[PDB]
Design a protein around this ligand. Structure first.
Ligand SMILES: NC(=O)C1=CN([C@@H]2O[C@H](COP(=O)(O)OP(=O)(O)OC[C@H]3O[C@@H](n4cnc5c(N)ncnc54)[C@H](OP(=O)(O)O)[C@@H]3O)[C@@H](O)[C@H]2O)C=CC1
Ligand SMILES: NC(=O)C1=CN([C@@H]2O[C@H](COP(=O)(O)OP(=O)(O)OC[C@H]3O[C@@H](n4cnc5c(N)ncnc54)[C@H](OP(=O)(O)O)[C@@H]3O)[C@@H](O)[C@H]2O)C=CC1
Ligand SMILES: [Mn+2]
Ligand SMILES: [Mn+2]
Lengths: 403, 403
């Protein structure tokens, strides 16, 4: 018998879940600081009224608030570093996020820079970012505390340590974070999430499924993540399409928000693999491409490559995914049982209108070698976590099949 | 549709899992202090050699160590308070546990007292303990850091905040703890656990099942605990009897240790209910009765009372328990589907030789009113968490049926 070995690490988590829990954002933020920077996107929280409510709750709690409404999707180093300058200039002592993964990550990045800085700055978020064997800047308890109110049932970021930040000079899109950038308090408000439009619901929903399916197949044992990851896939298969077709189906929104929370906790304990490592350089080189659409367009080839080069332990993991996708009845540990995960995946992608080759997104074949370099330079951990080896030419070939 | 509302709170967790991970206890403990009190029982870790190894690893890591080998099962206030006096007298700055729930809880209690004390003491662990509406002493970050190496696949205590301490003057056996008494590092060593004898394996195994089955039926929503709790029941039904009948079946030991870890995390997020509230005063008044045997002997009547006074949401939870126990195929939300959990429970208890009326343990009918008082004075939270009301006379009647 093969013995089981692992180390589980999960930072403290405080999750306020329900509809109308945006109410709490002020009382909770005051516990951590008197002056917040409020990090958001440019239009939807404002248009939907939740920006005004957050500001109200924060001020009413006695938290003086500076609004930073500049996060565009796929946040950049420049936008983080400029928001950190504001934190230093205004004296903010806590970073509050109201938005999706792009806002929550930008917020964590701002907390990092501003917390480690001198008076005017002298450090960039990129100093914390992996890049080849570059020795990163340690991320320490100096990181400012982060309060995260998510608006998508998409990234898990309200309960992960990670920020995903793009450098436009290199096109890299790495993740980074640890226990000191995990949000102190996490607010999941169904009244905010249920306003996602159908397309956003489907994209962020697929992100949930992508996290947990990679978390389960990542190399080594990780049994504390696995039941959360499995249940999330069951919730995706049962509720995601319900949420897309009726945004006001509240049960379905609640299950996708629980599923998204599972995914963040599961992705903290375990980690993502090749699909994430390759989707980063796609949105890195093509910033108008949504993260989840990038994941979708390369999923089939990657799952097929991992199954073709796998072993019985990895095949059994893919067979549990197939079962959770309703693509099969019995779990088994063979190449063929595992291959049903590809059928269930295709079904999922079709029901969500996410099955698009990279061509239909605007990716061009000439970019392959650059994007392959991107994947190894900036997502080396995910390549290492993948259950089967890949060479630089494996990844080139995978990109071409996804075109 | 009934909206979903909850707050999830889980302290930081660091779990080192494998066989031979006792190796790590010194390096890990040194991160938190230079001088440990090592809290253990009186004979088995010593006899089995693990006491000598721990001391070796601690000293070899440069952690000067004072051994406190005085924890008897069902630890008392007196034993905690005397161990705290040693911590103060010797200057210890970190508390290390090597043992079962009794040692781990005693350790947490010692960390509490010694951390909040003046020079010689002036405070008892009982000051932190619930007791009616007595205003407890707040448990704060002054609590000393705790390193927990468990030796039973039984209590979850290596990953809960709680200490369960008996006051022999009152016979109360409450639990108490929060984020500041959650172990900083948790070591699960299969080489230690696989030495549990058959009877201890079965008793502590039933404790795992008791935690997660109450965690799942506790009042309100708690979806982040539920998948861990479910998987634990699946592991109990599939491996516990294997572990009892062959202590050297390592796969089975590993699954019960994962199940026990699930239970601790699940019991931190959610909570136990009436079965635990009533089993406390049994071991409180009869300290030679094992916690898990006490739980076993009152389970059938309690499950029947909760099912008889339940609703469809609680019935559905019991039906999932029945399915996880292999007592039934389809989950359903009726009184009858739920009642199959009682059949699966009876099967479990019989396969483990735990189905004994309280009489066969030495409990006497004359004690009922005292034990009922015990349950409300000292386990009020669990009564409140139970999915159906109970009066003081409900609990008296339940005790009599279990006799
Ligand atoms: N663990 C981590 O740190 C992870 C990070 N990521 C990263 O997360 C980002 C995720 O972005 P994601 O959350 O998917 O979406 P984004 O945060 O990037 O932006 C979402 C878009 O949808 C709009 N929007 C957001 N919420 C709502 C809503 N409730 N109703 C209407 N419109 C809304 C936003 O409006 P506006 O423009 O007004 O904000 C914005 O235009 C990516 O950069 C990805 O790399 C992905 C996975 C995990
Ligand atoms: N979250 C919490 O804080 C919880 C706490 N509890 C409490 O936990 C305690 C649990 O006790 P539990 O862990 O069940 O058992 P105990 O720690 O009470 O003692 C176990 C007995 O078995 C012996 N022993 C322990 N490990 C081994 C081993 N690996 N091989 C051989 N002998 C062994 C001990 O030897 P020795 O005498 O040498 O130590 C002792 O005699 C109870 O007081 C209960 O109330 C219960 C559930 C949850
Ligand atoms: Mn993702
Ligand atoms: Mn118990």
């Amino acid at each position: 018998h093969m013995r089981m070995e692992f180390r589980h690490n999960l930072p403290s988590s405080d999750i306020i879940f329900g509809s109308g829990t945006l109410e709490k954002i002020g009382e909770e933020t005051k516990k951590w600081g008197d002056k917040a920077i409020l990090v958001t996107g440019k239009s939807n929280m404002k248009k939907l009224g939740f920006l005004a409510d957050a500001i109200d709750y924060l001020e009413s709690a006695g938290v003086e608030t500076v609004h930073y409404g500049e996060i565009e999707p796929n946040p950049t180093t420049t936008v983080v570093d400029e928001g950190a300058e504001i934190v230093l200039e205004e004296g903010c002592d806590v970073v509050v996020a109201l938005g999706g993964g792009s806002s929550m990550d930008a917020a964590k990045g701002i907390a990092m820079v501003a917390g480690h800085s001198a008076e005017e700055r002298d450090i960039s978020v990129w100093d914390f970012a992996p890049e080849g064997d570059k020795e990163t800047k340690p991320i320490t308890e100096k990181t400012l505390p982060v309060i995260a109110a998510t608006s998508t049932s998409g990234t898990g970021s309200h309960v992960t340590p990670y920020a995903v930040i793009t450098n436009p000079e290199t096109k890299g899109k790495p993740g980074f974070g640890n226990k000191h950038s995990f949000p102190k308090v996490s607010i999941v408000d169904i009244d905010i999430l249920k306003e996602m439009p159908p397309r956003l619901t489907a994209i962020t929903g697929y992100d949930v499924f992508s996290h947990v399916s990679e978390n389960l197949t990542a190399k080594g044992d990780h049994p504390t993540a696995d039941p959360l990851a499995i249940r999330a896939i069951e919730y995706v298969t049962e509720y995601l399409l319900r949420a897309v077709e009726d945004g006001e189906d509240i049960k379905a929104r609640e299950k996708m928000a629980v599923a998204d929370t599972y995914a963040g906790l599961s992705n903290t304990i375990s980690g993502t693999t090749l699909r994430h490592a390759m989707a980063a350089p796609i949105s890195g080189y093509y910033p108008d491409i949504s993260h989840g659409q990038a994941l979708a367009s390369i999923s089939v080839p990657i799952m097929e490559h991992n199954i073709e080069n796998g072993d019985e332990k990895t095949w059994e993991r893919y067979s549990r995914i197939a079962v959770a996708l309703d693509a099969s009845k019995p779990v088994d540990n063979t190449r063929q049982a595992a291959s049903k995960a590809v059928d269930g995946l295709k079904n999922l992608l079709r029901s969500l209108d996410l099955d698009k080759p990279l061509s239909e997104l605007g990716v061009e074949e000439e970019k392959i070698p650059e994007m392959t370099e991107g994947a190894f330079i900036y997502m080396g951990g995910g390549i290492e976590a993948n259950p089967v080896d890949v060479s630089k030419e494996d990844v080139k070939e995978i990109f071409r099949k996804s075109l």
